[PDB]
Amino acid sequence: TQNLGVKTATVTRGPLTFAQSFPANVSYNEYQYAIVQARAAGFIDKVYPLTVGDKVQKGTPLLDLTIPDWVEAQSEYLLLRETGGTATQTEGILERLRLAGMPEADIRRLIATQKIQTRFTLKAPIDGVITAFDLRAGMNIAKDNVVAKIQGMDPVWVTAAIPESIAWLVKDASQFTLTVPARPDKTLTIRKWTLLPGVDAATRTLQLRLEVDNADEALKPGMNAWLQLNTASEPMLLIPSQALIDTGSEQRVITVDADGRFVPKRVAVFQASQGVTALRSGLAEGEKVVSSGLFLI
Q: How far apart are the first and last CA of the chain?
A: 6
- Environment class of residue 250 by beta-carbon count within 10 Å: exposed (0-12), middle (13-18) or buried (19+)? exposed
Q: Which is nearer to Ag ion, 162 or 238 (CB)?
A: 238
Tell which residue, 61, 60, 62, 31, has the closest CA to residue 153.
31
Q: Which is nearer to Ag ion, 190 or 236 (CB)?
A: 236
β 19-27/190-200 pair status:
unpaired
- Min dist. Cβ of residue 204 to Ag ion (A): 24
Residue 135 contacts Ag ion per CB under 5 A: no
- Range in contact with Ag ion (rule: CB under 5 A) among 87-95, 142-150, 228-236, 240-248: 228-236
- Min dist. Cβ of residue 279 to Ag ion (A): 9
Tell which residue, 234, 219, 63, 28, has the closest CA to residue 138.
63
- Judged by CB under 5 A, the chain residues 1 through 30 that form the site for Ag ion are none
Please report, as a single letter, which amino acid is at residue 93.
I
- Range in contact with Ag ion (rule: CB under 5 A) among 28-36, 131-139, 213-221, 230-238: 230-238
Residue 169 contacts Ag ion per CB under 5 A: no
Q: Which is nearer to Ag ion, 167 or 236 (CB)?
A: 236
Q: How far is the C-alpha of 37 from the C-alpha of 35, rounded, in Å?
A: 6
Tell which residue, 25, 24, 33, 26, has the closest CA to residue 219.
26
Residue 236 contacts Ag ion per CB under 5 A: yes
Q: Which is nearer to Ag ion, 16 or 26 (CB)?
A: 16
Sheet containing 236-239: order of strands: 12-14, 236-239, 276-279, 269-273
The answer to whether 20 and 90 are in contact (CB under 8 A) is: no
The residue count for binding Ag ion (CB under 5 A) is: 1
Q: Which is nearer to Ag ion, 182 or 268 (CB)?
A: 268
Q: Which is nearer to Ag ion, 15 or 68 (CB)?
A: 15
- Range in contact with Ag ion (rule: CB under 5 A) among 63-71, 112-120, 126-134, 232-240: 232-240
- Min dist. Cβ of residue 267 to Ag ion (A): 14
What does the binding site for Ag ion look like in residue numbers (CB under 5 A)? 236
